[PDB]
Amino acid sequence: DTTEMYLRTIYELEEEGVTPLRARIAERLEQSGPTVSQTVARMERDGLVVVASDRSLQMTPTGRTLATAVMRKHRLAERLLTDIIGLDINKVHDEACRWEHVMSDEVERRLVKVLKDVSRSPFGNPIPGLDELGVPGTRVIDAATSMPRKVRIVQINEIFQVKTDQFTQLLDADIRVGSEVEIVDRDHITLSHKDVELLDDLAHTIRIEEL
Amino acid sequence: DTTEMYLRTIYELEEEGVTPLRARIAERLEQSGPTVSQTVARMERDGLVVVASDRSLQMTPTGRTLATAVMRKHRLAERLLTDIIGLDINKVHDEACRWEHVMSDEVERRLVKVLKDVSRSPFGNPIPGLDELGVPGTRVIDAATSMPRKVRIVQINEIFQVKTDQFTQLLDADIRVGSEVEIVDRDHITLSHKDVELLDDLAHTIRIEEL
Numbered sequence A, B: 001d002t003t004e005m006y007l008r009t010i011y012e013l014e015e016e017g018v019t020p021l022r023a024r025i026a027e028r029l030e031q032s033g034p035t036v037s038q039t040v041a042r043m044e045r046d047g048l049v050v051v052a053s054d055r056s057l058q059m060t061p062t063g064r065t066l067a068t069a070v071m072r073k074h075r076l077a078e079r080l081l082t083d084i085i086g087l088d089i090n091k092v093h094d095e096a097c098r099w100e101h102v103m104s105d106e107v108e109r110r111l112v113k114v115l116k117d118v119s120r121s122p123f124g125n126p127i128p129g130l131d132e133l134g135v136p137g138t139r140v141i142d143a144a145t146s147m148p149r150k151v152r153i154v155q156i157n158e159i160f161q162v163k164t165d166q167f168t169q170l171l172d173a174d175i176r177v178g179s180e181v182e183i184v185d186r187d188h189i190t191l192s193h194k195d196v197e198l199l200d201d202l203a204h205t206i207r208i209e210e211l
């Protein structure tokens, strides 16, 4: 389904921290602007995407769920193809781009059993959706949900910190008040600008807003 | 490509010894007669099939080559899915029906390396095309090409045989003068009606024609 290829392309552009504009989508899929526009209209009617006022495509909860599953199948296919089949690594991504459309959930569950590790694709990116498969401003500690979000730093509050080893890590990552960074919760909290895994005191006292 | 699914269906019906009529094709693919007819017309223009005077579809050399490759990919997929992945055996055929369309030759070559044996599918049928992948009347000894063909028995010539252990095997298989049987050459010659692997004396003296 062309729908799956559009949703996965949006997913991938978002992971790369690129705004999912229609022209970006068109260019990545090697499809015309007008063709992309016609497909985006069908996808809005289907409830999978909305076109935001800055013209970027924002996937709905349903659109995002489907996108996520397509990416999971793509990445599990890449692991099968490299770890077990041994297809030349230069061909693995293009093979998996086809296989992601035809792999059942049942095969994915089997792949999770058989593969050594399903943490990441061979190309370094996390395999999403495995839980779904079945097996002032605000303080960063609070504002962080569990999926990555771009936010703006308002206070770092160095003056209140007892532990200071991360001051330089923040500097080396160019995180200052004003920096736009992506924040994430884990099984410990993390900032992206480089990746800084915050100890609790900092996570409790650094503040983030959003425009 | 719908073309691949039509050619593989023809292949499969032929293997089952069924005449590949358009209605049989329609029924197996769960497509309408008129839809099948429109696709067969495109396939004739493309040079992949001819419609014979008995209305059966006869694949051209090119059509047969493509059909063969689709079947090979289907069967290698089934071996991957059962031997390595362990997908529940009741789901393997339907999964492979999708995978046969997206598997590259390069993955098939890898599967030949990794799998224990690629003689047959899990469902008992030979994996064709591996050589292409890269790794009176006439006497039966002569008339047999290397691919199976339906022929008619004209003489068995029992009277000239020194070895007679196969007389009963032929009887048990219902091969008599008049029987329509499919003959095949191997790396030793064989008759099908049951399968009788002929010793040379019989293969040299049994005669076959065709209407």
Ligand code: NI
Binding pocket: A074, A078, A092, A093, A094, A096, A123
């Ligand atoms: Ni990839």
Ligand code: NI
Binding pocket: B074, B078, B092, B093, B094, B096, B123
């Ligand atoms: Ni099958």
